[PDB]
Amino acid sequence: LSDIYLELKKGYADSLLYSDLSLLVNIMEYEKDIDVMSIQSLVAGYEKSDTPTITCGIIVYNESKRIKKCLNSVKDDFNEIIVLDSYSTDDTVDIIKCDFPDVEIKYEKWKNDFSYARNKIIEYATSEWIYFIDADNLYSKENKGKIAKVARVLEFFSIDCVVSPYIEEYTGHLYSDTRRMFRLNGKVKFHGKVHEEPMNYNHSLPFNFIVNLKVYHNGYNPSENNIKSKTRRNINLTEEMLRLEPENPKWLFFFGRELHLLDKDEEAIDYLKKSINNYKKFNDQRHFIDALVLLCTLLLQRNNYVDLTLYLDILETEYPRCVDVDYFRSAIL
Ligand SMILES: O=c1ccn([C@@H]2O[C@H](COP(=O)(O)OP(=O)(O)O[C@@H]3O[C@H](CO)[C@H](O)[C@@H](O)[C@H]3O)[C@@H](O)[C@H]2O)c(=O)[nH]1
């Protein structure tokens, strides 16, 4: 696909196929074989491709303070919006009924499984594609019209993937493994009680297309200082995930992270050490760098320089471009 793009850029770069493909960020990374044939019939053929429909799904519990700004941010850009309420005790449903009558409201007991609630929306959705957003997110106005173009180009090339907008924390931390959107063609389901993500039902990990969409995330802003509250909820769920895979370094990391967020640094260090130990021979090393960086932060703060040296050396070996290595090195000499 990077080849096809290089020629679409060269050979006349004002085709609607050119623009729309440029919404995709990590094109260089997509390695499945697309039979390059002739950019001419490809350009022309795109013009007649169908513009897929997209459902926007929101799972909600007690979001009175936020749901209106959230829905105002998505009200223009989706064929269908489904809100799945877990029997809120605040006035969440009534705000939606009043100000967003075209939103479909469905109800479902919370079962302490974020993947169950999301998959419930997938069952209810009638569009060709789904995109999930949370009540403490804002969909950027600059996204106007783009999410359907993304889905159009992906259907065109029959790319099986999930789709990640950039999500910006209040901190300015920018995430690109967010996996919020995918085609509703019976291939992808959410898996996990917490920290859930959409998996092929053989439980393999879909390719992740990063796209030039932006979503703001207010949910850990000190405006609402919900930090410790959301954290205690998630750690009870992370603990269940860990029981089922007590050697999984990803779950060990998330548990350590949440112990740390709950001012339990002692207790975090042991889980992070075991996570880092188990990551060496693990296939999905996505959070290996975050485990190392967090552990080095904790050891540094506790003046445990001897152990900090051990993990900083591992950090720099595995991730020589890590932007945090120089900081730790400067703090101990
Ligand atoms: O019992 C609940 C709790 C939460 N939500 C909704 O789930 C969403 C995400 O919950 P949130 O308050 O934002 O916790 P966060 O810590 O900000 O992250 C979230 O952590 C969750 C669990 O992994 C989410 O699914 C992820 O999208 C992640 O961004 C919200 O729209 C909530 O209203 C429910 O529907 N029912």
Ligand SMILES: [Mg+2]
């Ligand atoms: Mg949130």
